[PDB]
Amino acid sequence: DNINFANFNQDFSCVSVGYSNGYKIYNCEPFGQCYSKSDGSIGIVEMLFSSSLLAIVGMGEQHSLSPRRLKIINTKRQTTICELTFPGAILAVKLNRERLVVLLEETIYIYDINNMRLLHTIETPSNPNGLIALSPSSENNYLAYPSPNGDVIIFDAKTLQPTSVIEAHRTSLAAIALSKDGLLLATASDKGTIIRVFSVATGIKLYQFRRGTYPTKIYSLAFSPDNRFVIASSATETVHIFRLRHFASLKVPASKETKTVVGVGSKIWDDLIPLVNKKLVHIMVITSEGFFYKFGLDPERGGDCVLLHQQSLF
């Protein structure tokens, strides 16, 4: 394909992948397949941390799979928890320990993941690019989604009330992300010149970073799990690392306008590199072509990140 879909789980410790003939789970550290399952064509396959709970959506209409349907399964018990049938293409599925959120182009569905009770529905301006962020923290259980121009609505998925409207950018968003603890929001507009970081709990703009001079498509934002860094990849295939312009950067070895998703490992590693050992933050890049590139970031010195490993998800 080489792949239909690939995403990190919530703490960047695994990657889930959908293919024309099934889905796989990979551990990031060390890299290797830890689950495989033959099936139909899989469009979305999302994890719940490293539990055995998977959320699965078909790519294309099949007998037992569809883009309009969500299957919640348990890999250990090898059972189906439920299936939910929606009135249109599922653009995104996000999860934490208290909530399941399902995104359609003009509707957000919020579930209690414990009993699968539909808790609340949100009608929205068209979100064809399927932008959404859901806090991995049940204590700070916030949901962020755009409301076009570049407004971001913050929603309290615990109390089911709106919290704030953040005027992130003048034009429509290209990318969005929340921190591990749910408390920081990072944004970029479709112009991708400026990256912003907001306090979710107060709406306060904490940071602002210039990605570059000329506009570009930002594919992906991510926080380090300690809130020390925010990362951004784009169509130029330059990935920038901003420490809360760049403290560090790296170049993804892929053609221009290759879509990427980025993640950062939670631990600092004592990598042996040409010899010295350097304690490095691991930045991971998944390309639409199914390539997995792991770079090492010097949290002290920054600069251009060394490529540590290339893997393949196919």
Contact 21, 47 (CB under 8 A): no
In terms of C-beta density within 10 A (0-12 exposed, 13-18 middle, 19 or more buried), how is residue 82 classed?
exposed
Number of H helices, E strands in the chain: 0, 29
Q: How was this model experimentally determined?
A: X-ray
Q: Which residues of 110-121 are buried (b: 16+ CB within 10 A; e: fewer)?
A: bbebeeeeebee
* Matching residue, tokens 């590199």: 273
Q: Where are the domains of the chain?
A: 1-314
User: Rounded distance, CA 246 to CA 203, Å?
Assistant: 24
Count Cα atoms within 13 angstroms, Cβ side, for 183: 7
Tokens (6 digits) for 152: 């971001």
User: Rounded distance, CA 167 to CA 164, Å?
Assistant: 10
User: Rounded distance, CA 22 to CA 146, Å?
Assistant: 32
Structure's resolution in angstroms? 2.0
Which residue type occupies 40?
G
Where in 20-149 does DSSP place strands (E)? Answer: 22-27, 32-38, 42-47, 53-58, 69-74, 79-85, 92-95, 99-104, 107-112, 117-123, 133-134, 142-146
